Design a binder for these strands. Sequence first.
DNA 1: CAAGGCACATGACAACGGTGTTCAGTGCCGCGTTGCCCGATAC
DNA 2: GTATCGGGCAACGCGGCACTGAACACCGTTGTCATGTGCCTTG
Lengths: 131, 131, 131, 131, 131, 131
Amino acid sequence: PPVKGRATRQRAAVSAALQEVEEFRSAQELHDMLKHKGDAVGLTTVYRTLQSLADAGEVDVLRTAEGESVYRRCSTGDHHHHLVCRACGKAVEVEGPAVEKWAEAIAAEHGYVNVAHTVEIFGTCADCAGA
Amino acid sequence: PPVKGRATRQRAAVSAALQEVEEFRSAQELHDMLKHKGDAVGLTTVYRTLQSLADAGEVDVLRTAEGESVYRRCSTGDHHHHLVCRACGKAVEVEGPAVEKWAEAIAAEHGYVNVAHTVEIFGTCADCAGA
Amino acid sequence: PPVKGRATRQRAAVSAALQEVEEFRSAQELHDMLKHKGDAVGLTTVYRTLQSLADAGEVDVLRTAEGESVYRRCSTGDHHHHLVCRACGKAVEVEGPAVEKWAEAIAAEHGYVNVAHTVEIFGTCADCAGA
Amino acid sequence: PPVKGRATRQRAAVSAALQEVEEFRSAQELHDMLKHKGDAVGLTTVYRTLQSLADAGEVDVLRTAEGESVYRRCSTGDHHHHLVCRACGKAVEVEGPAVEKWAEAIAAEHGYVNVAHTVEIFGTCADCAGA
Amino acid sequence: PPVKGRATRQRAAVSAALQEVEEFRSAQELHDMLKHKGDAVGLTTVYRTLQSLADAGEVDVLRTAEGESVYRRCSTGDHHHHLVCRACGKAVEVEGPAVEKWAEAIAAEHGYVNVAHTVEIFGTCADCAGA
Amino acid sequence: PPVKGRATRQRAAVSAALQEVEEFRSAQELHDMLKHKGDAVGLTTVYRTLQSLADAGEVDVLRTAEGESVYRRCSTGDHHHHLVCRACGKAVEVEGPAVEKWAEAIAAEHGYVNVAHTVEIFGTCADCAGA
DNA sequence: CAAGGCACATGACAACGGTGTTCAGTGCCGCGTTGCCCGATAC
DNA sequence: GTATCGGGCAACGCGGCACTGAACACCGTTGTCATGTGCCTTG
Ligand SMILES: [Zn+2]
Ligand SMILES: [Zn+2]
Ligand SMILES: [Zn+2]
Ligand SMILES: [Zn+2]
Ligand SMILES: [Zn+2]
Ligand SMILES: [Zn+2]
Ligand SMILES: [Zn+2]
Ligand SMILES: [Zn+2]
Ligand SMILES: [Zn+2]
Ligand SMILES: [Zn+2]
Ligand SMILES: [Zn+2]
Ligand SMILES: [Zn+2]
Ligand SMILES: [Zn+2]
Ligand SMILES: [Zn+2]
Ligand SMILES: [Zn+2]
Ligand SMILES: [Zn+2]
Ligand SMILES: [Zn+2]
Ligand SMILES: [Zn+2]
């Protein structure tokens, strides 16, 4: 995840930390794992780099029911939606043409110019149910 | 509009206020409008009664980009998704079995036990462009 | 270290954490320890509670070489000075009237009204020197 | 105050500015003084030249209450401690064998190998009261 | 001059300072002027707010021969060009349709998709010669 | 390309290197190209030669957005303004009496004594879109 | 004597990291008060 | 004796004041990258 600013070791460390992890992790916990791993970057830098990466579109952002935001470096750059587990944080990418066609169908039948669809699916894993 | 607690004029007034207004209103602006009406109900009471109504399912909730939660009552008790306009706030009840089938198919494919879908689409209103 | 305002759990947790340890620690290290202990207190509130305690005189504030302010709940409530080991963080309680008398002597000789001595003896332990 | 680097007019100007004034002044205020005097030297160069002098020992570094580090050129070459008035900024150098004796006694008693002591006393001078 | 961020006294002060001045001023010169006016905002926030205002398009950015950029608020919102006096910093709004027409003519004859025109005339102030 | 200094093969090689090239290159890139050719000329001498040529008037300079100044030998000695591409960088000499006449007209009607104007326009190259 | 040419230095802008404001929502003890039930009492 | 009604009393309600916490804004200090001196050497 390259950052559009001038190359520096804090950006490199944050990008590598996103690369290693594949789960939706908040800014605070991401800073916590950076702190305990040894890179030792600040928290406002984590905010700033994550926000810039989200603006550039390198990582996808999700809003949890609590009110915080969580980040993750998706494997595919194509537009997709996510299946997430609150108990584990695991996310898998899913794409469906049917929901897209429904979206523009509804937009056309209401006559709106352009629309933005936010579809998030939340579920519990079968392994999580097992104890 | 029955509530879990004992009926009172304050909760009756807030239920009526939700009845007339058909737009997403946050708790603060709802309280301001109610005070403008003249009932002068406490803000914390409005907060807790809105939370109770949302829990009971009579009122649907939506988390905006800023973070404040907006509340209004939907005429149809059946499950549906709401279309919203930022420039107007108009809300229309839209339902489609296709997204339900897509979500349940993904849940069956990935072995998740039970899932909940939160599908919200944001678009630009038709008359907003006209000026 | 009771707080002037209403007692609450987010402040009782901070007080308990301060009473638990003896080393100097900043608000952000203390916040991490509080979080990983299982209390989940916000950082701004940790900062505010430490500021209030230091204003009331319950805790002793100190600035490291780098300039970040650290705190500690000391056993003795009387006038005292601290011996610190930056490699280990243990603080030793030492008090001397000679430096006080020197302070009044210098103030009287140079005619100053009031005096505030900031005396701090940094050091390295014999055990620390051993490898 | 010779500077470790090659002789240049930027170093000469910063050294002359340090020599002219007798009050503890920060790097940001020293730069403004130089800018008004006609030097036209950049701020980063002032920062790094003051650091070079500080590690060279030719200047005495100090920290203000709010965290900014201030500097002053003291003519006395022997070890000494400073008495500074916050309202005026005027500083008078003082020295007392009592603090050295106490530091040596504490180091001997508690077994610390080597120590470093910081002793600064803050007070208001006579002219502050006069008005 | 509102800023895209939350309203604060630092942004208010920098906006008022830009409103008062009629000549081009850099970031460091404006910071010095605003420091001597007594508002005392930092230089970093001056940089950030000026870049935010330039991005919003409220102020005009001009690069001098030395390479530094100078900002000034222009009352006329319509696109125009500037005539400046490097001896004073004065600016007078000026516009010409012939240059713009030549711009699309040259772009079309060489088939460039879109173009941007940077025309800046540097002149000697009328009263500068008089002495 | 005569040089104000004594003729030597450093200046000869620099003049030749500017001779074959037709694209705008900064001094560091020109030095890298010359080193690749194997002449092994110092970078400070490269600067000195380029500023000497610019003062003499053989070459023309424009300043990039980042701040780098690029030198190029224009075939036409007459005063003209250059169109350059963001990526391709090809330069075409375009001149128009209209902009000049505008410049002296404004200088006269505002009474400016003498004016030094710079005209440079940026645009997206024709074949850049084609891929 | 002057140009060549290193090593090290410079200065406007970008980037960093400990602390501090915002502003929508939560916690708690002071009250009122609905609601029931027994006491009195009219019949 | 049977009867409705009033009042005591509890167990819930309201509700203003102080507190909270994730996100955004801050000021002093350090870093990046293209260009500029001090000083030694050779034509
Ligand atoms: Zn994604
Ligand atoms: Zn799971
Ligand atoms: Zn989609
Ligand atoms: Zn609904
Ligand atoms: Zn649905
Ligand atoms: Zn609309
Ligand atoms: Zn203590
Ligand atoms: Zn003492
Ligand atoms: Zn130790
Ligand atoms: Zn001194
Ligand atoms: Zn001493
Ligand atoms: Zn004084
Ligand atoms: Zn303008
Ligand atoms: Zn124009
Ligand atoms: Zn002028
Ligand atoms: Zn040319
Ligand atoms: Zn021209
Ligand atoms: Zn091109």
